[PDB]
Write a protein that binds this ligand. Structure first.
Ligand code: ASG
Ligand code: CA
Length: 482
């Protein structure tokens, strides 16, 4: 039975790496300027041994994505449609009153809980953000983890600096990272402290002779953008401000962590037995350019928390830590080494892919929104899964009170506009012809737009979505307004 590592980077979009995730018309990687700015040599090492997905969808912000990864359910269905504010219910003015602020529940068959039931040692390290303060989900031990280092209801760290006690000595006390007291006062960067702790848990799992699931959930690369002195000297582009250079150092330190975990697997002799899934949790938050133009994920439009592709396009790499044709466990999930997969995947697809390789099954009667990636991981187009992603955000952020719906080449953006709830607005893009969202064409294809609204409307109902409300609590369902 294989070990599984989900290496999840906070606020890391598809361009925040030296690995090119943009595909040309031949399905081959194309280098863009951000790929020559970031330095992720261990991601390059992992891409050499595995498969990159060029189109991989997450939700637009943290808790919705982290809920979706744990449950295999869309944010419509698990109900965590906003990032969770630990201290108070952040519905936002027009948010659904019954949205799942409390978060993941002790009774949910989460990926870790199903693995734990099967005898896996399940380890959580770093950012959890599965529940509010005082909730079941605040504590990863309540949703199927045997071990939690540094996870709580917090969604970012009080500091990256060990000298600042990660918030306990200096910085934001109410976001102080827990469980790392032995690093306080030292010059150990938060991302380094988490790596040391993860490698200690991996070592302990191997000596106990149990297969493990490691949720390596970095606080990197979320603000505050506090530069790592180990890497800052490499970042000197005159058109990148101090914040962007700090962000680049959080990326490079994240990549060092990935390398130290891969080295530890090789040192223990278990690399042949360990699957690594690498992704970000939502659209990239790099402090570059213009938030609703081109910057954080150029050449794609937008940023973390927007309705654009930059809001929800994350990097995704799957690789055996040491590929080996002889390996029994690798025959259950063969990966085309050094290749790019251009067919769409989503964070809901992780649940069914991991449970199958682990020798478990998706519980037959548990309704999921994910598809086993086995066929796509071999480097083939999988006709058993749709080219579709539905990103429901009935809350306030860089974009507000919207649903996006992608079906094949087409993307609908529906704005509920709760302040003028009788006059909603729909936009239409052809992402095949216009991947940078430059050519809004609802006026030119009014029937494609009408059809997408009906399909999206039916899918929101099928998934049990909670809708935004107007000032007086009237439920705002999408409708063909024209
Ligand atoms: C504009 C922006 O990005 N705001 C983020 C918010 O989205 C959330 O981050 S999130 O990664 O959890 O979604 C929160 C976590 O405490 O931190 C804020 O700074
Ligand atoms: Ca995030």
């Amino acid at each position: 039975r294989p070990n599984i590592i989900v290496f999840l980077v906070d606020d890391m979009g598809l361009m925040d790496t030296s690995v090119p995730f943009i595909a040309d018309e031949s399905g081959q990687p194309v280098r863009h300027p951000l790929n020559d700015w970031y330095h992720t040599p261990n991601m390059e090492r992992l891409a050499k041994q595995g498969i990159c997905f060029s189109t991989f969808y997450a939700q637009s912000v943290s808790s919705p994505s982290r809920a979706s990864i744990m449950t295999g359910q869309n944010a419509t269905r698990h109900g965590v449609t906003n990032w969770i504010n630990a201290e108070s219910n952040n519905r936002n003015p027009f948010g659904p009153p019954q949205w799942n602020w409390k978060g993941l529940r002790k009774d949910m068959p989460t990926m870790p809980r199903v693995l734990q039931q099967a005898g896996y040692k399940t380890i959580h390290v770093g950012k959890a953000h599965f529940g509010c303060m005082g909730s079941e989900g605040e504590n990863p031990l309540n949703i199927g983890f045997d071990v939690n280092i540094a996870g709580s209801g917090i969604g970012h760290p009080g500091s990256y600096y060990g000298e600042w006690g990660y918030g306990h000595i200096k910085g934001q006390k109410i976001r102080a990272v827990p469980d790392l007291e032995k690093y306080h006062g030292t010059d150990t960067f938060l991302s380094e402290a988490l790596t040391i702790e993860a490698n200690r848990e991996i070592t302990k799992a191997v000596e106990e002779k149990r297969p493990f699931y490691l949720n390596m959930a970095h606080y990197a690369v979320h603000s505050p953008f506090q530069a790592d002195k180990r890497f800052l000297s490499r970042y000197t582009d005159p058109d990148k401000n101090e914040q962007a250079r700090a962000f680049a150092t959080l990326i490079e330190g994240m990549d060092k962590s990935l390398g130290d975990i891969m080295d530890q697997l090789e040192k223990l002799g278990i690399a042949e037995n360990t699957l690594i899934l690498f992704l970000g949790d939502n659209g990239g938050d790099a402090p570059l350019g213009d938030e609703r133009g081109y910057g954080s994920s150029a050449p794609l439009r937008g940023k973390k928390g927007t309705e654009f592709e930059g809001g929800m396009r994350v990097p995704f790499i799957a690789a055996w830590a040491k590929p080996e044709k002889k390996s029994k466990v690798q025959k259950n999930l063969p990966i085309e080494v050094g290749s790019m997969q251009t067919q769409l995947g989503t964070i809901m697809d992780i649940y069914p892919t991991v449970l199958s390789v682990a020798g478990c099954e998706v519980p037959q009667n548990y309704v999921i929104d994910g598809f086993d990636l086995k066929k796509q991981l071999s480097g083939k187009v999988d006709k058993k899964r749709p080219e579709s992603f539905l990103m429901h955000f009935p809350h306030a952020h860089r974009g507000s009170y919207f649903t996006t719906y992608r079906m094949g080449d087409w993307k609908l953006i529906y704005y509920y506009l709760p302040e003028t709830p009788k006059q909603p607005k729909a936009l239409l893009y052809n992402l095949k012809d216009d991947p940078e969202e430059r050519n809004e064409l609802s006026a030119a294809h009014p029937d494609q737009c009408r059809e997408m609204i009906r399909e999206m409307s039916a899918r929101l109902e099928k998934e049990g979505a909670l809708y935004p409300v107007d000032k007086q609590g009237n439920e705002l369902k999408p409708f063909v307004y024209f």
